[PDB]
Amino acid sequence: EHYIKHPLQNRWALWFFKNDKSKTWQANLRLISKFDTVEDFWALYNHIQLSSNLMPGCDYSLFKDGIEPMWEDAANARGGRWLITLNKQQRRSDLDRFWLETLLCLIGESFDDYSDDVCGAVVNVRAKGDKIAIWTTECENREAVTHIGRVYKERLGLPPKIVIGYQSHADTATKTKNRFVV
């Protein structure tokens, strides 16, 4: 009413990663918080560093509850990602606003019939250039993948002179070909 929190469609988990000389997948990856309302999202978002302020080598990731933040997870293994690559100028002009928009696309279920194909999203802060990506569950679901790509591109406001690519997780792990481009 004037007192119930506004539930999200899904419960989400926000993860932090930092590369090191440590265990990596235990040591370096840690769960910040799980949330399932709008109010709890914003309280968490407002409490943490902007991606632009993270040390190179660090990631944030947001995944649906039940999906581990790793491509080998059952929901990710046959999947892939729409990839946004950012140079150093874009770290200042685009990184934080694109990432918030990405978060909002996820928790707002912005992909119509195909929101269920979304697994999560990741921002990589790197010296050689930042990356944001939306992970989806199945590379062969052409309708779902294409629709998510199109909507995401338009929510980021990217003009036609730029294309973004989708790559299979397995393909990228081998060394990368785009399965789709929009």
Q: Is 25 annotated as a binding residue?
A: yes
Q: Is 174 annotated as a binding residue?
A: yes
- Give the span between the Cα atoms of 88 and 68, in whole angstroms: 30
Which experimental approach was used here?
X-ray
- Give the span between the Cα atoms of 169 and 175, in whole angstroms: 10
Q: Hey, what amino acid is at 148?
A: I
CATH topology of domain 1-182: RNA Cap, Translation Initiation Factor Eif4e (3.30.760)
- Give the span between the Cα atoms of 21 and 30, in whole angstroms: 16
Q: Is 112 annotated as a binding residue?
A: no
In the chain, where the domains are located: 1-182
As to burial, measured by CB atoms within 10 angstroms (0-12 exposed, 13-18 middle, 19+ buried), residue 106 is buried
User: Is residue 78 a contact partner of residue 137, using CB atoms and an 8 Å limit?
Assistant: yes
SS (H, E, C) the chain: CCCCCCEEEEEEEEEEEECCCCCCCCCCEEEEEEEEEHHHHHHHHHHCCCHHHCCCCEEEEEEECCCCCCCCCCCCCCCEEEEEEECHHHHHHCHHHHHHHHHHHHHCCCCHHHHHHEEEEEEECCCCCEEEEEEECCCCCHHHHHHHHHHHHHHHCCCCCCCCEEEEHHHHHHCCCCCEEC
Q: Hey, what amino acid is at 102?
A: T
Q: Is 11 annotated as a binding residue?
A: no
In sequence order, the 6+-apart residues with CB closer than 8 A to the CB of 135 are 63, 71, 76, 79, 80, 81, 118, 119, 120, 121, 122, 169
Q: Which residues pair with 60 in a beta bridge?
A: 16, 123
Q: Is 130 annotated as a binding residue?
A: yes
In whole angstroms, how far apart are CA 96 and each of 28, 60, 83, 142?
23, 12, 15, 29
